[PDB]
């Protein structure tokens, strides 16, 4: 698709859609806990509706009308074997999370994915779960998917400390716990987003934190909640950048999640001299409106602790260095490389395309900041971000044309993302 070029202004008010980790989520809780749950604003991108329908797959009531999703609760030893195989799409944090979910289905189930999902290891998922007796193998020592996985009703519960900072991880190990007889022990490597710990205890479960140590006790009974879901961070990070980059623009972005776990593009936003101011905060439902307008930046180190609280946002985070005065270093990013794409490799190359100046590197990249962009043609190899990057990027470019292929991945996260787009270059 031709992408818009050469804006001159950006102006207006957005309401992103809804947190995408959340929502995987609220239908997780909803499918295992017992009685009705409801979420309201869920987000509607691809990945949401793969979760979805792999629980309806497994026998879960999930209705969506008049904006409102309704799930009839299965207990938490409720779910049943499918008809056919499950789809997770594109979704990496589908398949992950639900590996746990299934710790004990007494079945066999197989699970796949798109082209993009199915050069993802999920190792890192089907060792620990191997310890609590799940019987759980994919293609190559990495068990890339198809996966096929045949839970047990004798699970026993996990001690394990992760070797990397995933949330999907410790999130998967979490719902097996919880299906666990005895006592499980989850210790971070680095703090990562805690959207599992929250939702837990919001649905009647229990646990202890104490510092990176998660402590499950198992098994519990959860209760149907009403789930409210804020907008993503994630989704509001396109128009955060574009605000302080593109010339003559103020945007406000209203109802954006703000839990500290998932809030590292603003300190980074900061630390590189953006204009950013922070109002309406709603201290208990974590959110807050964000107000960018243009700003001229300077280069910033973005390392370890800091990593997992933006680790999404970093293709477009390359753009914003990318338009900052002298050099941006990432770094402790090597967890890109197993992304949708290689987001090190291909948000390197696509930007190169476009004006370049990034160096890539083993464990992330270097930006020399104050590129003038160019024409090019992007694809988008079934990412989402990479999509949405480049169209932000495409508005910087003053003279030639921008050419997006497969931009449909997009709908992955954010099917409206264009229809805000429209809606801020009229203002
Ligand atoms: O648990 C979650 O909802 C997510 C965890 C992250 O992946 P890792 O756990 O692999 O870092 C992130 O990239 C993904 O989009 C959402
Ligand atoms: O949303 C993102 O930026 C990355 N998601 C990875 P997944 O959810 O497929 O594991």
């Given at each position: 698709?031709?992408?818009?070029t050469?804006?001159r ?9 809804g ?44 209705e969506?009308?008049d ?7 299965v ?8 008809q056919n195989?499950?789809?997770m ?18 079945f ?6 798109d ?39 004798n699970?026993r ?17 979490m ?38 140590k ?50 590292g593009?603003?300190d ?25 307008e ?12 800091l ?6 946002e ?22 890109l490389?197993?992304?949708e ?8 190359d ?18 020399k ?6 024409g090019?043609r992007?694809?988008?190899?079934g990412?989402h971000?990479?999509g ?8 910087l470019?003053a ?7 497969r931009?449909e ?14 809606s801020?270059?009229?203002?």
């Amino acid at each position: 698709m031709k992408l818009k070029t050469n804006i001159r202004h950006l102006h207006g008010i957005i309401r992103v859609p809804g947190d995408k980790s959340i929502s995987h989520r609220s239908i997780i809780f909803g499918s295992l806990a017992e009685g009705e749950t409801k979420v309201y604003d869920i987000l509607r991108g691809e990945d949401v509706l793969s979760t979805m329908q792999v629980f309806r797959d497994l026998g879960v009531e999930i209705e969506d009308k008049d904006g409102v999703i309704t799930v009839q609760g299965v207990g938490m030893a409720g779910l049943k074997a499918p008809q056919n195989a499950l789809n997770m799409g594109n979704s990496g944090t589908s398949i992950r999370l639900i590996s746990g979910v299934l710790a004990g289905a007494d079945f066999e189930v197989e699970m796949f994915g798109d082209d993009s999902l199915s050069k993802r290891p999920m190792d890192r998922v089907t060792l620990p779960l191997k310890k609590m007796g799940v019987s759980i193998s994919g293609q190559t020592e990495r068990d890339l998917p198809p996966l096929r996985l045949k839970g047990t009703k004798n699970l026993r519960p996990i001690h394990y400390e992760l070797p990397i900072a995933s949330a999907q991880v410790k999130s998967a190990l979490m719902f097996a716990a919880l299906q666990a007889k005895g006592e499980s022990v989850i210790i971070e490597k680095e703090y990562t987003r805690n959207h599992t710990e929250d939702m837990l205890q919001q649905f009647g479960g229990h646990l202890s934190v104490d510092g990176k140590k998660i402590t499950v006790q198992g098994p519990q009974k959860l209760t149907g909640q009403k789930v409210v879901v804020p907008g993503d961070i994630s989704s509001a990070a396109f128009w955060l950048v574009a605000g302080l980059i593109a010339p003559n623009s103020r945007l406000v972005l209203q109802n954006v999640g703000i839990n500290e776990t998932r809030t590292g593009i603003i300190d980074v936003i900061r630390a590189m001299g953006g204009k950013l101011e922070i109002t309406e905060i709603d201290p208990v439902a974590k959110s807050a409106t964000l107000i960018v307008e243009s700003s001229d930046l300077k280069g910033t180190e973005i390392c370890g602790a800091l990593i997992p609280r933006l680790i999404d946002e970093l293709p477009i985070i390359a753009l914003l260095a990318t338009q900052a005065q002298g050099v941006t270093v990432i770094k402790d990013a090597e967890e890109l490389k197993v992304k949708e794409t290689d987001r090190i490799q291909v948000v390197a190359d696509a930007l190169n395309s476009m004006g370049a100046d990034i160096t890539p590197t083993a464990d992330g990249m270097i930006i020399k900041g104050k590129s003038a962009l160019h024409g090019a043609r992007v694809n988008t190899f079934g990412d989402h971000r990479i999509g949405m990057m480049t169209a932000i990027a495409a508005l910087l470019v003053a003279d030639g044309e921008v050419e997006l292929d497969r931009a449909e991945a997009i709908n992955t996260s954010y099917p409206s993302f264009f229809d805000d787009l429209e809606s801020l270059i009229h203002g």
